Amino acid sequence: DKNARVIELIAAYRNRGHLMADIDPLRLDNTRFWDLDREFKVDQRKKLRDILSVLRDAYCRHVGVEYTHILEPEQQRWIQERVETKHDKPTVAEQKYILSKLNAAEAFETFLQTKYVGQKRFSLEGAETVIPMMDAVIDQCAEHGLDEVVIAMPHRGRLNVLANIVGKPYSQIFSEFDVKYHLGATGTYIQMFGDNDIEVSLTANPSHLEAVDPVLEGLVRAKQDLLDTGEEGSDNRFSVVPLMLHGDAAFAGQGVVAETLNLALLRGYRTGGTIHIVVNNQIGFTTAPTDSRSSEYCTDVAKMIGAPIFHVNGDDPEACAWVARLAVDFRQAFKKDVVIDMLCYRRRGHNEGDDPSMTQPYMYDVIDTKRGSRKAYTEALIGRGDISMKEAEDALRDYQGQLERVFNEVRELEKHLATAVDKAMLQRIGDAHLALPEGFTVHPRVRPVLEKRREMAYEGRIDWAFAELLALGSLIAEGKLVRLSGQDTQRGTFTQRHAVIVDRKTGEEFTPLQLLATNPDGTPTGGKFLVYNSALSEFAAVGFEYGYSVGNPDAMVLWEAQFGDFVNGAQSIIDEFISSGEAKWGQLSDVVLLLPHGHEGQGPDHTSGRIERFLQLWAEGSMTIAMPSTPANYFHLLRRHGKDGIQRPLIVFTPKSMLRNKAAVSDIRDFTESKFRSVLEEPMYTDGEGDRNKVTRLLLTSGKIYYELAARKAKENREDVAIVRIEQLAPLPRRRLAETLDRYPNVKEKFWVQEEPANQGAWPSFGLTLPEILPDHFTGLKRISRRAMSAPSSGSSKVHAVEQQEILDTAFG
Amino acid sequence: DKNARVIELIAAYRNRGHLMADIDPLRLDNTRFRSHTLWDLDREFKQRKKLRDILSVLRDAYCRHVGVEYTHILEPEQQRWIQERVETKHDKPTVAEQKYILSKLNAAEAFETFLQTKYVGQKRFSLEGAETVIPMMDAVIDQCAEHGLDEVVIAMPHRGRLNVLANIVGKPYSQIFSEFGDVKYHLGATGTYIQMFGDNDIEVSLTANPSHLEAVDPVLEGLVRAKQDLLDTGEEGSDNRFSVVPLMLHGDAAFAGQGVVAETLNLALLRGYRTGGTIHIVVNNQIGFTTAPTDSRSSEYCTDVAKMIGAPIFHVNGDDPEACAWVARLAVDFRQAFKKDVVIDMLCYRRRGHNEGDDPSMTQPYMYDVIDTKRGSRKAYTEALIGRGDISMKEAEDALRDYQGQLERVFNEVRELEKHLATAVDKAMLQRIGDAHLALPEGFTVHPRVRPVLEKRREMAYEGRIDWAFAELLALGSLIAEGKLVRLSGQDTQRGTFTQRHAVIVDRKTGEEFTPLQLLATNPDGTPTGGKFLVYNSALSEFAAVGFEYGYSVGNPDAMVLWEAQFGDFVNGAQSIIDEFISSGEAKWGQLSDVVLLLPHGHEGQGPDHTSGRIERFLQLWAEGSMTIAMPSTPANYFHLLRRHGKDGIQRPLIVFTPKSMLRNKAAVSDIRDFTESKFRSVLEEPMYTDGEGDRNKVTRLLLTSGKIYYELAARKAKENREDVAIVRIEQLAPLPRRRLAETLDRYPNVKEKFWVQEEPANQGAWPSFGLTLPEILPDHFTGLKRISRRAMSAPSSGSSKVHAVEQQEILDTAFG
Ligand SMILES: Cc1ncc(C[n+]2c([C@@H](O)CCC(=O)O)sc(CCOP(=O)(O)OP(=O)(O)O)c2C)c(N)n1
Ligand SMILES: Cc1ncc(C[n+]2c([C@@H](O)CCC(=O)O)sc(CCOP(=O)(O)OP(=O)(O)O)c2C)c(N)n1
Ligand SMILES: [Ca+2]
Ligand SMILES: [Ca+2]
Ligand SMILES: [Mg+2]
Ligand SMILES: [Mg+2]
């Protein structure tokens, strides 16, 4: 049974060989490491010695291969065939080219640590092989004739990446020389040995490690949709490649990594596979891997989506470049993620004042005996007889010339619009709900919704749900790309949207708004409706949609929270990208966040989108924040946002029970002959027979509580009280608010009325701002709200009801 | 050619057999059992077994109602342990065990019927189509009691929670439906489980949680670890039993989409966070509200994230309660043997719509047409027992009588329910903590850069000029000496981010760790104090780490628990824990926590992600008695703040905005007397008025501030000899120290103008809340209060250190202009 022992041995190398591969350039773990002439049958008859030597070189040399966890047998076979073959040794030209990339990379590092103070944390020393590795990824993408490689990375080696991968000149990199470590960049990569070129860009990011991961994916997907490539394209090339860099401690500890990997094969989020590179320097500031992860590898999270993982020795730039090229080939064949775990080291301390032997003495005693990756490769090429002593001297002169070039170039640098639509547009969107495909079976409970929409489009009484689809549908008809997504967003959390309808017999999906992408003459408008149900993620989903608006500034991008209360799971994206990206990096986004909000007795996690937090984050021109009370005002808000020619995030506090409130409906004329109104008066004063001069008490409010206040006003016939709505919370509509209040000359008292606790809602900012920006109108402004609470509401629906009545009685008391 | 094909086939069943297992009770995928020589079946292969016998063992173990994933496990002993228990002829359960399982399905299903009939608006909580989770959870707990363990702590979302309370926790209906009501779906509970066939009992508890699915996952881990440390079991125990078991329930869409799941799994084998393995149960009803699995995950299984830590995964058919109970018992046995997580993927269905107003055939017509033909799990099991001849017709009839009796009991019981302190230490304490830094173990080699820190600490302890970093260790060390358990953790927290702490020192030659404060756990006479110092470097996580420390403070209310952010700027990665547990858990659930968050804060030119812990956000979250929020300016006041927090006998979170450059500021040092003869000061005056020769009556301009900007304001006042300006510090930001604030400002009668001074932008720091609150709570003192700060910004600061420097000077010039 000698042949049986061979089969088990072959399986052992393929499954576990990576545990014995020489991947660590520091060799920190000591414990880590005759039928030979008899011919055995293999899938071919070869000697056991030749079977074993192919398996040791393939799996136990400088590359640890993990692929037997992949469920697809064709993917396992593809890797097996490319890994278990005698590889063609690289040509002297390729070896010299790798060496030139190592020279440029280390001369950049030497210059950085010598020329400037405070640059130790950014050092790529001990990890310079990432430069020829990233070069091989991009060169291989250009070999496949792809259009672009978009990079996302943390700060380590970023300016080196700018100079030696993006190809930015020193004059631009060191111009007015820390924000440079967070800025976006764009360039063109020209193949050294090939005849192709490819676009290379780097995205902007905060210091929050891994938070840019879903942003990168969103941005790339936006670029893929524009190029008609990938999931929403005519071709299956996915010609825009995400190249995502990571650190070993951050890759294992940050939850956003798993959420972003979870998007990789989703119809709404896939980008045809991401190339991941982990700069595994086997440390996280002062922290050893045993305190940073509970798994053998920092890349083990990527096993979640059956991605192949390649652990590679960073002191072998040839194996690193070969693995990079294999990764691109796998991504092209299976449109799925590949992870490259580059084992390397951090030569110097984490930052100034870090003596790394204080916390890691054993590691740093080994590192202190380490010659650079460039010097090691130069000496290895001599040993193998690949390059002559003269060639190695020319290589050192190239190093010096590159070191001099950067010093000399930086030295010279130091020396020197209506939103209204026509009735026919409303009618076309209405009729689109009944223009079903041949033989389509509508669910019996969905059919009245489609009939009511055709009725509303011709007769009025348009509800919130339809007004939103009227805004999006008219934008699609004008040629705009509309991307809408979130948890159960196709149907709607409150069963109100039905943007996608499902055939009761076949399960086939029909999207009524997609018919507006075609003009009445049959020609395309250039518009699209891309609507998806998201994964149960907030961080990665909000990240993605923010990224998508950056990737396509001409798109209308909306993310919807199930309830506004769950958006705090995406706080890092709100804080680091959405509210602040423009001021910090000049990076613009027109992303829309829809946050269902309102006190209805559903508890502290189904009541508030935390208005007070978005209002606190706001500064002049950073975001638009609104809480519309009418369907038409919401329609005009969305149309203004998509057509204003301005890239600024919009935060909308959307209704729940108010979706079905019969008083919260709009007339055809409000869509065809009106505009967005930042401040709304009661219709009895603007259209009715109400007398503004009789008003002595003015109630200022926003949202659904208006209807309750107006119902109470009508019941008691209170002509002395007027209700004014602030529809646009930020920026404050100072002019409209001044002109509106001036029309009520006999007002003796003013109250800001809100459902939210005293420390929440708009009061903390309005109570401070309104008396300041409008002292003649808001001096003496008082608050009517729920009491200050440590949670957004009471957990009891009975307590909610008493508090709601208490607000209305106080307002009319 | 024959024996080799068998070995490959054995490997194929072990590796991929789970892809062909009959695990889905709905059988939605038709192609599932179609995309996976006859003379060799009778030939024996080398133990020597016939190929037909090898194939029968493989098919029964890997292709029936249990899908086993385990060959991804790197440890070969763990793979062999599973193989041996799965590839054997299992003992058929006794009729008593089968009847006991059936009685748990009767109870589970009678509770579901009652819930949907008695009350309105309970559809969203329906466990219907997933009732087998109750005999499965029962088998987990019973198996933990069989191992003689102390407690099982459960964390779960809302689906089937009250059923779990009644049939697992054993809470009576009188308590469950008392004044029914939605808050009951988020409350903690405790009970005792008594073995049906065994002689042991075990404690069973359920922890509180928000609606935020999976956010409780790290909280559960923290809580269990605190309970294990108290029981001297596990990682910080004399025994390696880990006698407190985390039982974590999940939904299939949430388990795959929430990042906190992966961060919590990442903690499972860490010395500072391990709990000896968690038993995970995913209630995989193959839907997430209206969303199909193909839009919720990019992997074959919702549980594929657990492959990250090489956890064994069992996919089990929820219509086979015998396989479900067997797998639950095997999971407990594996967790006991290897102290690692086990994940049980229970495939089931959601019988009704997601909530009121959901007609599930609108979005999932194919799935709901199949579900509409499904008989309950109880009825299916009752009929299967008849078919196998396990129970008689009379036995199936008494089973149906038991269901009716249980349905009547809950209706009848609910019907009957409706009818009815000094912080000052002695100088010897300071000296002991100082000397402890030099009381090195025999032959210990101190790193040459760490030795001056040890010597300076012995010097400071005896001579004064105590800096912030030593004051913090003086507060923690004195608490340990008094018998308190101190747990301190965060990113690079052993050494400290600013190389200031050195709570753990590393031997330059051997790498061995020495903890100077741990010497204070032993009295000078050699007896233990009862105290302990648990200090760790955390994983590079905020959400799971903050979650863990909050849960740890709940698990042991007598512990001093502190979590440190690398920089306050990264705590927004844990916003869900701050919002849902820390700031609000007491008001929502009556759940108390004394957790401390240390947030390094201060404008120093390091950018918008290395400047602010967002004071304005914690101040906004605050409501009377929910949290204590402070920004101390002196080492002694920080020492007294921590000691008051650990000794006040009150369970309330403390948020501390801690220094960075001010750690090394020579003016920010304290005298021995500040520690030995003082207390925490919520409001601080300039020493020239309290100890010096300054005249308070000369002051016409009063500057109110907090934090390090005080030193810059005081340095400017000294330079220009500004006797007309006084600087008052608000050390305790929340609750506002109204009485101390008023009494302090009354001592400056000639003040004509008052300014709140801060480094933070106008829309940040304490101004948005103080600017609104101070003129209201103290109208005679703060009417006309003006702000001096940075301009309002969309980020916490400028990205440029040059812009920062101009703005910093602009604040100081405005304050003295
Ligand atoms: C989400 C979040 N939370 C924490 C941090 C803090 N933080 C950093 C700075 O910001 C601070 C300190 C410094 O450099 O001065 S660097 C760092 C360690 C990174 O380890 P890694 O992934 O192995 O990488 P490598 O450094 O290439 O070895 C952390 C943990 C962060 N930025 N984002
Ligand atoms: C982190 C976060 N983000 C979103 C939500 C919202 N949300 C829920 C309610 O809260 C809301 C609607 C409802 O029930 O009325 S339930 C739910 C779907 C759950 O799918 P699952 O895991 O497969 O489970 P199952 O329901 O047992 O099948 C979501 C996505 C949340 N709670 N937490
Ligand atoms: Ca816009
Ligand atoms: Ca306390
Ligand atoms: Mg690292
Ligand atoms: Mg589900």
Curated annotation (Swiss-Prot), chain A:
Record GO terms (molecular function): 2-hydroxy-3-oxoadipate synthase activity; 2-oxoglutarate decarboxylase activity; dihydrolipoyllysine-residue succinyltransferase activity; magnesium ion binding; oxoglutarate dehydrogenase (succinyl-transferring) activity; thiamine pyrophosphate binding
Effect of residue 384 to A: Increase in KG decarboxylase activity
Disruption phenotype: Cells lacking this gene do not show any ODH activity, in contrast to wild-type, demonstrating that this protein is part of a functional ODH complex in mycobacteria.
Cofactor: Mg(2+); thiamine diphosphate
Region 2-oxoglutarate dehydrogenase E1, C-terminal part: start-end pairs: 1-813
E.C. numbers: 2.2.1.5, 4.1.1.71, 1.2.4.2, 2.3.1.61
Positions of thiamine diphosphate binding: 156, 207, 209, 248-250, 281
Residue stretches in coiled coil: 386-416
Annotated acetyl-CoA binding sites: 624, 640, 675, 678, 728, 735-736
GO annotation terms (biological process): tricarboxylic acid cycle
Effect of residue 648 to A: Loss of activation by acetyl-CoA
Keyword Transcription regulation: no
Catalytic activity, reaction form: glyoxylate + 2-oxoglutarate + H(+) = 2-hydroxy-3-oxoadipate + CO2; 2-oxoglutarate + H(+) = succinate semialdehyde + CO2; N(6)-[(R)-lipoyl]-L-lysyl-[protein] + 2-oxoglutarate + H(+) = N(6)-[(R)-S(8)-succinyldihydrolipoyl]-L-lysyl-[protein] + CO2; N(6)-[(R)-dihydrolipoyl]-L-lysyl-[protein] + succinyl-CoA = N(6)-[(R)-S(8)-succinyldihydrolipoyl]-L-lysyl-[protein] + CoA
Notes on activation and inhibition: Alpha-ketoglutarate dehydrogenase and decarboxylase activities are inhibited by unphosphorylated GarA, and allosterically activated by acetyl-CoA, the main substrate of the TCA cycle. Both the phosphoadenosine and acetyl moieties of acetyl-CoA are important for activation because neither CoA nor the synthetic compound S-(2-acetamidoethyl)-ethanethioate (which mimics the terminal acetyl-phosphopantetheine group of acetyl-CoA) has an activation effect.
Record-listed Mg(2+) binding positions: 248, 281, 283
Keywords noted in UniProt: Acyltransferase, Allosteric enzyme, Coiled coil, Decarboxylase, Lyase, Magnesium, Metal-binding, Multifunctional enzyme, Oxidoreductase, Thiamine pyrophosphate, Transferase, Tricarboxylic acid cycle
Consequence of changing residue 155 to A: Loss of KG decarboxylase activity
Positions bound to 2-oxoglutarate: 182, 207, 606
Function noted in UniProt: Shows three enzymatic activities that share a first common step, the attack of thiamine-PP on 2-oxoglutarate (alpha-ketoglutarate, KG), leading to the formation of an enamine-thiamine-PP intermediate upon decarboxylation. Thus, displays KGD activity, catalyzing the decarboxylation from five-carbon 2-oxoglutarate to four-carbon succinate semialdehyde (SSA).
Protein family (similarity comment): Belongs to the 2-oxoacid dehydrogenase family. Kgd subfamily.
Domain comment as written in the entry: Is a fusion protein with two major domains exhibiting structural features of an E1 and E2 protein, and a short sequence stretch of E1 localized at the N-terminus, which is connected by a linker region to the rest of the protein.
Subunit and partners: Homodimer. Interacts with the FHA domain of unphosphorylated GarA. The 2-oxoglutarate dehydrogenase (ODH) complex contains multiple copies of three enzymatic components: 2-oxoglutarate dehydrogenase (E1), dihydrolipoamide succinyltransferase (E2) and lipoamide dehydrogenase (E3).
Protein name stated in the entry: Multifunctional 2-oxoglutarate metabolism enzyme
Included range, full protein: 365 to 1227 of 1227
